[PDB]
Write a protein that binds this ligand. Sequence first.
Ligand SMILES: CC(=O)N[C@@H]1[C@@H](O)[C@@H](O)[C@@H](CO)O[C@@H]1O
Length: 355
Amino acid sequence: ESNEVLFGIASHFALEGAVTGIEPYGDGHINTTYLVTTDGPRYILQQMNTSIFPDTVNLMRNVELVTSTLKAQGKETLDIVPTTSGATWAEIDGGAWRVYKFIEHTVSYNLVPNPDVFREAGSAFGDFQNFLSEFDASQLTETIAHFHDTPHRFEDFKAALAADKLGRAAACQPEIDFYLSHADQYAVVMDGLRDGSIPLRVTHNDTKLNNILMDATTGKARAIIDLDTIMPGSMLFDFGDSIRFGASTALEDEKDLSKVHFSTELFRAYTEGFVGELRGSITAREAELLPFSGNLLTMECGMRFLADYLEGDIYFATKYPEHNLVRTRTQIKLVQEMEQKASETRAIVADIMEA
Ligand SMILES: CC(=O)N[C@@H]1[C@@H](O)[C@@H](O)[C@@H](CO)O[C@@H]1O
């Protein structure tokens, strides 16, 4: 939006410096995010996507509960900057806006540069699972229904495919047929949750690497950010999604497929950190499904990218027409390698589970 509008938005919030600039920031696909520069402190300003999160009140109640609980344990988290009237967010001209303090002295990654970073990521999310277990499910109402219900996502995909709104299906038969042919695999976690063989836990639900901030000196995790999808789920949702994004040797939207590989060394690093925090709570069935949770969350994200492509890119932010097709192709390549390397990942998990 225009600067005049954005500076106007900023005036609603209890900022502690004169605003010098407001610039688009980051590579989130969901909310619209800006960096607020002032004559002193920095801020993150976000317009919340109400298409995706229609219940702003409940979303912000969840974020408030999580952050306040963290604060009350002396743990660094997202710091909501209230409106000048003391609200946690503002509705301004049909849009929903919030502000967080900018988290200083941090670095973040779209791509793992070495195993130590990814091990730290694993430790961070594993520990966060322990933290979240202090809530009961009723405290955190789901902000999006069926969020990691892969069979439900597959129904959405099949509908998008059948409608073929833009006639884009013709150019992506191999990708479409990949998702269709994997239909027998999608229900494994949901079935286990439904019959009680997989514990229902409170989870983060979007554990991609760029949602953690590492300290610029120590390299230790400083804060987990993007708290919008904290709700009941399976541990496997958080594990699988982390492996999806972070065990790849390439960016999520890497055009050159020959650069895209699933790294078992990176898998090992994350799992060491993750399981290292959760050894006392992880069940036999959860441990058994750790490798496949990689496949599943990658296929889920991929079919979502492709469905969006087939629907004309209504859900995810895109930079060019084919962007979601480029995204779905990396996810497919990753799953193909995860399948091929299955015995190796199983062995890695078993080795970590005993030690
Ligand atoms: C809320 C929401 O849809 N979040 C999605 C997440 O589920 C996954 O699709 C990710 C891929 O980079 O993009 C977003 O963060």
